Every structure is written in C-alpha cells, then in structure tokens.
Design an enzyme around this catalytic site. Structure first.
Site, PDB file in Angstrom:
ATOM      1  N   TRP A   1     -14.856 -49.238 -17.000  1.00 24.83           N
ATOM      2  CA  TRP A   1     -14.435 -47.890 -16.609  1.00 24.83           C
ATOM      3  C   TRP A   1     -14.012 -47.954 -15.154  1.00 24.83           C
ATOM      4  CZ3 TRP A   1     -18.099 -43.517 -14.746  1.00 24.83           C
ATOM      5  CH2 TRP A   1     -17.353 -42.376 -14.429  1.00 24.83           C
TER       6      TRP A   1
ATOM      7  N   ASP B   1     -25.035 -46.693 -18.704  1.00 28.89           N
ATOM      8  CA  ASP B   1     -24.095 -45.582 -18.605  1.00 28.89           C
ATOM      9  C   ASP B   1     -23.953 -44.953 -19.981  1.00 28.89           C
ATOM     10  OD1 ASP B   1     -22.126 -43.721 -18.023  1.00 28.89           O
ATOM     11  OD2 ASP B   1     -20.794 -45.152 -17.027  1.00 28.89           O
TER      12      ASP B   1
ATOM     13  N   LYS C   1     -18.579 -35.325 -22.412  1.00 29.74           N
ATOM     14  CA  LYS C   1     -17.823 -35.563 -23.635  1.00 29.74           C
ATOM     15  C   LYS C   1     -18.513 -35.038 -24.891  1.00 29.74           C
ATOM     16  CE  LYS C   1     -14.991 -38.022 -21.057  1.00 29.74           C
ATOM     17  NZ  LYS C   1     -14.903 -38.012 -19.571  1.00 29.74           N
TER      18      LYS C   1
END
Lengths: 412, 412
Positions: free
Chosen positions: B140, B222, B258
């Site tokens: 990311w 994460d 999300k």
C-alpha cells in the site's frame, strides 16, 4: 516468562487539570467548586449544545444526497472558504487577489501541527530544525509540545504575564522580540489569551506589528475563540485582519471547538496568507503530503455543520446569537466577580478581571493563596491562579468571591 | 516587491491515481472504464452508503442525550472495546486476562502513524530511529511514507508479488525475513493484500508465524478490510487471532473505512496486545501524549456509529448483511472475469483472479499490456496491473475481459 518489549516502558504522568478535576470528583465537601474544567459550562454547571448546531445536524441527518466518500486531503472545499473568510472578512481584497488557501484540520491542535511540521522543512532554508520559536510566558500548555515534537529544540519564552498589577507587559516582551534570532516564527494569540485573558490593545498591536514587520518575523496566529471571546467576529479577528492590510503573511490556526461547541468533532482550519496566488497553490500542494502521513484526509461531520452554518444567512444569524449567549454570560460573571471582590474591600486592584477577554482568566493569585482555595475552601483551580470563568455561576459566585477575599487577606 | 518565504517552494506532484482518474474524467470516449477508483463502487458505478449506517445516524440524530464535549484522548471507550473485540474475538481469553487496550485514531492511517511514532521512541531501546522496517513488494503506497516521516531511514522490501504465475512468493520472502536485522518490526497485511489480493494460506501463516517467532520479530498488522474482504469476520481476522493464542504481541491497525463505508468519518483503532496487564496501561499512557500533539482527541461521529452497531445485536446482524453484500459482489465480479478470460482462451492462467481476496487485485499485466488498455481501450488502471474489482459491472465486464484478451495477445 521472557522479557516484554512493553515492560521497561516509562509511565507517562497525569497532567495538570486531569488530576485536578479527579480530586474534585472524589471531594465529598458540598460547597466544592471546579474552576479548572476545560470547556464552557452553563450557570447550572452543564455542557451546552448550540441550538443552531442541533438544527444543522437534523438537516444533515435528513439529506439523503450526502455520501461518506473521502474528502479532498486539504478538506471540505466550502468549509475552508467559509472559515478563512470568517477570520479575514468577506470584504477583504486579500481574497479577491487570490492570496490564501485553507487546510481543514483536526481542531486547533491539528492546524498547528500541520503548520508547524510544514515550517520545519520549508521555512528558513530547507529542513531547518534549528529556527527559534516564539512561545508566551505563560502559554497554552502545548504550544511548546506541538512545536517541540514537530522538531525545534529550543523554545523561547517572551515574558507576557506581569505578576504585579495583573496586566500586559508590552515592551517587556516587545523588547525580548528584538533580541531573538530575527526572521523566526511567532505563534501569537489572535484574541482571548490562554490562559491569561489579557489581549493587546489595537494600539499595542500596531506596535508589536510594525516593530516586528520592520525586522524579520513570521506570525503564526492561534484563533481559537473567534466570536466566543467578546461575543462578536468583527473585533476578535481585528489583530488578524490588520496584519493582512499591512501586507504580511502568516499561518492562522482557527478552532471551531469553543465557538461552535464542537469539541468532540475536531473542526479546525489552517489559513495561509501569501504574496500573489503563486506559491499558495504550492504551499497547499505539499500541505497535502504532510496531511497524508498524519491522517489520510479530515472528517466531514463537524466541518459540514460549520460550513452549512457560515454559508447560510439565517443560520449564521442564529449562530452568532448563540455565540453572544456564551459570551455575555462570561462577561457578566466577570463584572460580578470584580464587583463582589471590590464590595468586600479586598486588598488590591481587580480591574484585570473585567479587562481580560474570553473564558480563561488570571486572578493574580500565587500558589500559596491558591493552595488555600483548593484545600480549605475546595475551590479547584490551577496554581497559576487560572480560573474558568464559566465555572462561576449565580450560586457559587458569592462563596468564591468571599473565598478569594479570605485567600488574599489571610495568606500573603 | 521583496522575496516570498512562500516562493522557492517545491511544488509537490500529482500522485498515482489522482492523475489517473483526472484523465478518465476528461476522456470523451463513451466506452471508457475507471478501474483505479479508490473505494467500493456499486454495479451502477455509484458510492454505496450502508443502510445500517443511515439507520444509526438517525438514532444518533435523535438522541438528545448526547453532547459535544471532548472525548478521552485514546478515544470513545465503547468503540475501542468493540473494535479490538471484533478483531480478536469475544471468546478470546486474551481479553479476560487484561492484555490489550485500543486507541481510537483517524482511520487506518492514523492507527499506523501513532503505532509508528510510538515505536520510534519506545521500541528497540529508546529513540531508536535506526530499526529496520518491513514493507512488502509491492505494498500500500504509504506504508513507506507513514514509517519514513515517522523517523526510520531505511525501508526494507521483502519480495511478495511473483510476476510469473501471479501468486504468492512464500519462502521468496520468508527467506528475506531471515536475513533482516532480527528483532525488527513487521507491518503484515491481516487479509486482503493491498494491492495484490493474495493472502497467505492458514498453513503458510503458521510458517511465517513460528519461523519469525522463533527469532525476533514484532508484528504490526494492517486490518483495513476485516469482513469487507471475504464477507465475514471470522476468517478475515484468523491470521490475527492465531498470533494471540500462540502468545505474541503486536500492534493491529484497524480501519472501518471500507467495511462500514465510513471513509470520510475517519474511524480507526490501534489494538495493542501485551504480556500481562502490566505495561499495556503503560503503553496507553504515553500513547495519549503522542496523540495530544497530533490531534488533541479523536472525532466522535464515526466512532459512535461503529460502536452503536457492534454493541447492538440487531444492528450487528444488519451490518454483517450489508458487508456480505459488498463482498459477494466482488467475488462474483471475480468469478465472472476469470470465466470470460477463460472463455476466450486467453493465453495464460487466470486462477489468481478468483484466488485473490478483497477489492483490489493484480491482473498479472505489465505496463506494456496495461498501456494498451488505457490508451486504445480507455480502461484506466495502474501500470502495476492493479484494478478495482468493484469497478467491474455487468455492462462493462464483457468489454474489459475482451480488452484484457486483446492486451495479452497483441502485446507481449
């Protein structure tokens, strides 16, 4: 059984007020008073939500047009425009000439840290971690921290509070501003000096202005109580709006926490003034990159409320009314305390109580007198003699005044 | 007339997708497709707000009990408890034994930066700015940035994407994990690898687990798509919940952006696992002090919604349904793309498309093939061959597949 990376961790320790109010909480004495609470309280010792805020929240709650997709890194477009426009004025030609961008941040604190972390990499050369820093004596407890942990290793205290006579020490610090390594940055309080309440007069601002224009200084305002201080936007932003018509530039850190009551929604804006539309777009550019690593983008709820309010004429109207409410109460609790102190022939002058502006105020007491209020009379306040004026109500006011009378008289 | 401190400012430059979608915006071609959009889109190419979120927002909008006073620095109490409990499980005895605190942060990004800035001052000695950092290849885009601008000056890339065969390179990086200066920190993707979509199998996780327990590593998970990835909370958090029953510790960075669709409300939590209730209270202590300088305290709106949802049984129910919706759509658009690629006898294997989990997916294309999709067929995606699967709908899917067929065949 083996080590803990977590063991060998230094506990951090209970800060100033957090321990203060905790002691108040366990105090079983029925005449106790908390004057160290860190927000605005009503006369019934309660948190107040602005009706105009409850109003907009309903409008938002019903707008099925809104989504929850990421905002621009710099923040909600409308907000930044309204916020900066609020501080600099709609009729400011410094807006027509495209001098300024806003950066939506996380309260007032976030506006600093972003404006801070920016300077420690693009101000005074490149990656200049050595540039001196202006902090008042005393100052809001983490003007130091926000600039320290931003890089800078010296922090410079220009004297501000004058213990005897309880007022402003103008050239006491205006002189100190001369000694400094010139071309350094200066985080000035726009209005309502935390934690004293004494602001320079417009005349005295002109002095501090030119004398440090003349000679190498970059302002870094902290407009945290605009409107909330004296009950109006026009004079609270004057020290800001003067610096623009002279032809300065600065970062202005706006907080909407106290003047919208939106503490837990973390609404704030960094206003950045320029020369010419040139490098503002350049500042805003790598302002984004600083934000990206801190919070990817700012939250929307608090910003929409302020934006919906400031953009609409019949909400702006209602809002300034609500702000005038919180204001007038404080100014009344000032004039009342002063009067009651003067009515008891309390040894000393007490003009400062009514001359100071805003929610916080220096009484002029020294921890030996304060010690008396806290332990014998259970009036809780910081050793620096700082009180939250909104902590004063119509029921405790007569007790507190009389207590302050006892403190100054009995203990020198 | 004189200089500008603002002049001589380096413009920063348009990042990867921001320029990509902008080009898509101006593209007048009617068969254009944007597969580089950075959130979840519906089959009609639209942002989706979870009904359970619109539901709780109404409940909040009507609770006149709530105020806007500052939250605890670490955040809303209920939120942190629900969030960590979500990632570690309610029946986790690592909760009964008081091992963990949560820190409410600003999205997933904020959880990192706080957990990051913490390690660069209390991990591996004191003020250790030299400790190596684990980032995947690729990762990311601002795992690097968040740890770079947190201090650390080397960043170490363990190979993760295996270009040929389009799948996981296990001991390709499991070996690299051996070479590293051991006792370094490792920011692992919990599930849904950004930007590849390939997660290790439970067996392979055990491998990476022990082999780096055995020998000096601190995980820094994460968890950004828990539940949102495969449509369920139980298996998405498995790689997390295994590390706890073995007896590890780590920081877990949760993002609710999300999986609640709450992107612009910036909801996130840093989960911190310990030994014994000892130094967790110690970690949380000076976690506050790190936060205080970043944002004084976190925002409430986004957190309340998640907290109200996860604490209530008939909202949790509705929520997991909404999450399963977003999920199932992606998995369907995967099985469909793969099938259509296989139906056209497209040269190569395309299992990876259906084996990958989550919203992002590596197609296996190389910029020469991708260049074809973007310029000739106006399918916009990153040169790394990364697509947003939710960008695939029932109307463009047949065009895109055929386009991918043309790319791989015509251009080697």
């Amino acid at each position: 059984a083996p080590p803990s990376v977590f063991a060998e961790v230094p506990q951090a320790q209970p800060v100033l007020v957090f321990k203060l109010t905790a002691d108040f909480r366990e105090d079983p004495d029925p005449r106790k008073v908390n004057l160290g609470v860190g927000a605005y309280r009503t006369d019934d010792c309660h948190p107040w939500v602005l009706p105009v805020v409850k109003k907009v929240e309903q409008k938002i709650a019903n707008d099925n047009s809104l989504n929850h997709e990421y905002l621009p890194i710099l923040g909600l477009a409308e907000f930044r425009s309204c916020a900066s426009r609020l501080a600099l004025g709609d009729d400011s030609p410094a807006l027509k000439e495209k001098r300024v961008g806003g950066v939506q941040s996380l309260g007032g604190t976030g506006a600093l840290r972003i404006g801070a972390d920016f300077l420690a990499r693009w101000y005074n050369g490149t990656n200049n971690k050595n540039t001196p820093v202006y902090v008042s004596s005393p100052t809001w407890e983490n003007h130091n921290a926000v600039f320290s942990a931003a890089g800078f290793k010296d922090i410079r205290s220009y004297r501000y509070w004058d213990a005897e006579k309880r007022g402003l020490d103008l050239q006491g610090f205006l002189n100190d501003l001369e000694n400094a390594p010139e071309f350094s940055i200066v985080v000035l309080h726009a209005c309502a000096h935390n934690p004293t309440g004494i602001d320079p007069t417009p005349e005295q601002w002109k002095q501090i202005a030119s004398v440090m224009k003349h000679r190498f200084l970059f302002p870094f305002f902290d407009s945290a109580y605009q409107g909330f201080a004296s009950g109006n936007l026009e004079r609270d932003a004057w020290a800001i709006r003067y610096f623009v018509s002279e032809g300065f530039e600065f970062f202005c850190a706006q907080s909407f926490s106290k003047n919208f009551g939106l503490y837990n929604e973390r609404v704030g804006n960094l206003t950045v003034v320029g020369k010419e539309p040139e490098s503002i777009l350049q500042v805003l550019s790598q302002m984004e990159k600083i934000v990206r690593i801190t919070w990817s983008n700012p939250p929307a709820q608090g910003a929409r409320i302020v934006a919906s309010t400031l953009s609409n004429p019949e909400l702006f109207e209602e809002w300034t009314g609500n702000v005038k409410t919180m204001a007038d109460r404080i100014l009344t609790m000032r004039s009342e305390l002063r009067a009651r102190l003067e009515a008891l022939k309390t040894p000393g002058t007490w003009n400062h109580i009514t001359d100071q502006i805003g929610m916080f105020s220096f009484t002029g007491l020294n921890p030996k007198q304060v010690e008396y209020l806290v332990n014998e009379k259970h009036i809780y306040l910081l050793p620096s003699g700082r009180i939250n004026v909104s902590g004063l109500t119509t029921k405790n006011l007569d007790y507190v005044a009389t207590s302050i009378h006892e403190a100054v008289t009995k203990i020198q």
